[PDB]
Amino acid sequence: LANRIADKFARAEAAAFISGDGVDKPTGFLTKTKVANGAWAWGSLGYVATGAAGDFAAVNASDAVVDLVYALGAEYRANASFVMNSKTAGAVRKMKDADGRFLWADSLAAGEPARLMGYPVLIAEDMPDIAANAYAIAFGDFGNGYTIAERPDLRVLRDPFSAKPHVLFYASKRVGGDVSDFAAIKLLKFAA
Amino acid sequence: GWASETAALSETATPRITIPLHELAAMPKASQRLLDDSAFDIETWLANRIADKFARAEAAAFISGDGVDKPTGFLTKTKVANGAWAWGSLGYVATGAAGDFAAVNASDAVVDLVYALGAEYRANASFVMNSKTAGAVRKMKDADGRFLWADSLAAGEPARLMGYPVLIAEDMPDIAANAYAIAFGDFGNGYTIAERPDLRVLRDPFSAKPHVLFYASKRVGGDVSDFAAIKLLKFAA
Amino acid sequence: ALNSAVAAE
Amino acid sequence: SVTGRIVAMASGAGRPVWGPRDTVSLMRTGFAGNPVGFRSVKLIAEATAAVPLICQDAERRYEIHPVLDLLRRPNAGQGRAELFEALIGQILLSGNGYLEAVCPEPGVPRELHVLRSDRMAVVPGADGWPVGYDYTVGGRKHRFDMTGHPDPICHIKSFHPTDDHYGLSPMQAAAVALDVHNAASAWSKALLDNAARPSGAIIYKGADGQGVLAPEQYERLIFEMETHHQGARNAGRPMLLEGGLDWKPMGFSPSDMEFHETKAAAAREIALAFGVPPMLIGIPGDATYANYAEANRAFYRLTVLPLLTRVSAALAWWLSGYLGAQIELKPDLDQVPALAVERDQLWARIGAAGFLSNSEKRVLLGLPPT
Amino acid sequence: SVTGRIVAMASGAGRPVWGPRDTVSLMRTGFAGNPVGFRSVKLIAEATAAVPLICQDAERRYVLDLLRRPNAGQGRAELFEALIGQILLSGNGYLEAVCPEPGVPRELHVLRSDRMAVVPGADGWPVGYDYTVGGRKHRFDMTGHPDPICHIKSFHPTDDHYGLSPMQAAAVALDVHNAASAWSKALLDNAARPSGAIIYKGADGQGVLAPEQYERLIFEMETHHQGARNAGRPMLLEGGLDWKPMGFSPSDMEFHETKAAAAREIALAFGVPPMLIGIPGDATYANYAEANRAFYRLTVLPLLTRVSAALAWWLSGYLGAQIELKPDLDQVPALAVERDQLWARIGAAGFLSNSEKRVLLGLPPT
């Protein structure tokens, strides 16, 4: 049971780090009043648009990614990384040029080349899917952009009273965090 | 649940598949006169062709076997469309066209089949196809006419598809109307095989007197253990 | 001293 | 050898003979099943591996011998003590001992592998000699060939008066006594696990011949029974029983000793078949031997040194076919620590018999003369 | 080796063979569950760690700094008490060595065996070992000469990869000894004996007594008729009342001789004589000098000479010269009755000279 608790905690706080609200839970970077880049202010995260309203641009995809990269500044790109869920890295890998050869991961036998546009990729399964106006791909330097405040201790409590027919394991880690540097996280709206 | 300061949080949700271990029997009949005059070890050649048939008869039950008195393969597990995946069923992705891979863009029904598993089961997963499907995968060509898999017309079978091994198990269905001719998943966790570790063969001239009637049997069983660790590829929608 | 930040008591 | 042709064609030449039908099952329920059959083998198998060996050819000078270099480490990951305990552990278990030998160079083979006798079967061949041995793992044969001079397998047999090709394995002789000791121990394991003794019963007949008590009455009856009348802290409450009620105390009439004297007698027949004395492994009973200087001396003379002197006698003849000169391996019977009371009365007889000279009593005791 | 190609493809090439399923359910019920299975392992593991070792094969008895200080944690004796504590429990001893240096590795870690499994591979000896804790593997490699794990096995006649572990052989007598001690534990905790019963039938066949009568009946039973200070009050029973005294007929010895026989067949499997741990019963050995000498000769020195011989081969893969490493069977205090009758035997043999009896005892002649 100590294994399935430590697993759920590492998976329940993983979703608050991205799409959590402020109420009694860490505020993820996605709930931060996104504003279009170029008009970026301090209280908001800057996003760039892909073109088409559902998915990547129909005429020329793979450009909504390269201008997502060049919307950070050469200081935050020193160590930045994309953050997507699983079925989005698949939609990025499904990107093919006019002949049919998958711009990312050249041969079929390739796999995850682990460096979209020269930067790491984090397959975080709590980011939104490709949808009407979802920010399904975020790129930025989270080492400065997102600060996690936590205590190293799970602090599980084993309780042999008050449920004597049972044993009633209890466990409560303390964790919190929201963005600390709005300039170090850029998003990718799939709108027009 | 995200415990409030003064909420007095209440108790939360606390979180068996049986493998009947069926029996596979071979009883070849042989005349006693034959086991004395032939120069070949008919005692052993029958023991060689049973062990070959057993490793090949349970290989087919591991894929398309029903539950009744034989291991139920993963292909008989009430397959449901992905995105609507439940626990009691295996999730599949559709290729587009009704017969074969998508006519407009194939090789895309494979990359989203890969990315339909989850990054934990993809640590060690492998495609499973029959012989004439890996051929249809290798026949996949881009707009220029080159092969997406194993680029040059020389040096075939690269032994890796999307970075993952490929098991050419010739007991899966081929490309057909609604066949799941390509399965991808982590079977080390997804399919558990329960078996007895011996191939018992025992002669007995007693049952039929002018004959020998070799008796050979093994006990094997197994079904799916993790429905989240095996995805299929329906060729219908 | 029963409560944390919520009280201010 | 002249009789070889009619004894070989009877069972069937050129086809495998499988041997005993339950030696593969007696290992599971007679060696890993009970402690007495477990300990009796491990006491003998770890005693025959303890005794040193003597390599002699007419001068006995071979303490640097290649066979003694071979036996000191047979193969990678199995020492001398781990080889013989695995070899004697097949002789006592299935009556058959086997040794593979791999030889790149045609003399003195590099490795000795104790092939297990569960998965080995003989081929009786043409002239009453087994032509092949088939190592059958899964459904796969190997068929070693002994139609040559080195003959890559020595086949150590125990005595079997009925069979021509295998041994008898004292576990198979005590297989009825293993089944009494396995089951009388599972009698007590079961009896502690599924048996109902109550310490009493509280009879409530009622005004009728039959009557249950009300659910308000049943919680009241348990609460005065749970709180006031059970436990060690409530042993002897005088228990007012009103009309209808009655406390009928139950018993448990066989308490100790469920097949206890037929289990210890069945434990001793397991120890009687392999040949250990019961004071050695620790079976309770009458002290036949006295003081462990007798029983450990009776252990290395009735069931260890007769066993080890014929395993080393097959190693003396099978190995010597790999190197021209004949080799004789036999146990030492000197600085083996249980034969000390045998060695005392040899040295006290010849030491006190002062009528003959000193150089004449060194050769009686086995000393180099001076 | 030639038969290696046939047993590994049937057992399954390149996969982990798990083996015993109850290798950890016997530890918590047979080592932390009953004192006989507890003591018998701790008696042997503390004894095999106490016998010193000597370095032969060097042409003169001298890696002895490695064994006396393996790592930052467990001490020399702490290493062997954990190593033999796995061979006696699960039949398998494992030894990780870390070697940043090319030879004579720095640390020895006893990898516990219940989280450890082999993989056979294509031929012969196992190719790797998998230390699987949680869901995470490690996959050591044996496809080289230094071979970072020594795998010490006890004798197993049917399996090709593990040991038999005498706790598995005495697995019934552990359950008879656990439950018979849990029989008496439970029976003291849930059993109603009464010292008697006061039966109030009444004028009818049945009748309860009023609460003014029941509080009166408790008070004269509490004050006057219970306790050690009230043994024998002659108890006037009126019309209708009656005192029927109950007994408790099986009082002593609920599974007493089946537990003591189970407590000795645990000691029979591990190899300890029953005098050493304290099992009551018959006197097999007499005076403990032959009971301790039977212990260090039947089940300690056969056990430690197989572990030290596997340390001798595996450590000699790191330094070039092959080393031998065997227990000394001298300056051990249990074999003193073996030793003094040896010193009395050739010591009184006055025919042979003084330089000829120093060589019999292992003394350097002067």
Residue numbers in the entry:
A (entry chain B5): 194 to 385
B (entry chain A5): 146 to 160, 164 to 385
C (entry chain C5): 89 to 97
D (entry chain A): 24 to 393
E (entry chain B): 24 to 85, 90 to 393
What do the authors report?
Gene transfer agents (GTAs) are DNA-containing phage-like particles produced by some species of bacteria and archaea. The genes encoding proteins that form Rhodobacter capsulatus GTA particles (RcGTA) are derived from phage DNA, which has been integrated into the bacterial genome. Here, we use cryo-electron microscopy (cryo-EM) to determine the structures of RcGTA before and after DNA ejection, and to visualize the interactions of RcGTA with R. capsulatus cells. Particles of RcGTA have heads with a diameter of 38-nm and 49-nm long tails.
The iris has to open to enable genome ejection. Therefore, the release of DNA from the RcGTA particle requires re-arrangement of the baseplate, which is consistent with the observation that one third of empty RcGTA particles lacked baseplates. The central channel of the RcGTA tail above the iris contains a trimer of tape measure proteins and perhaps also one molecule of peptidoglycan peptidase. These proteins have to be released from the virion before the DNA can exit. Some of the empty particles with the baseplate still present contained density corresponding to the inner tail proteins, which would not allow the DNA ejection through the tail. We speculate that the empty particles with attached baseplate are defective and never contained a full complement of DNA. The structure of tail tube did not reveal any changes after DNA ejection, suggesting that the tail is not involved in signaling to trigger DNA ejection after attachment to a cell.
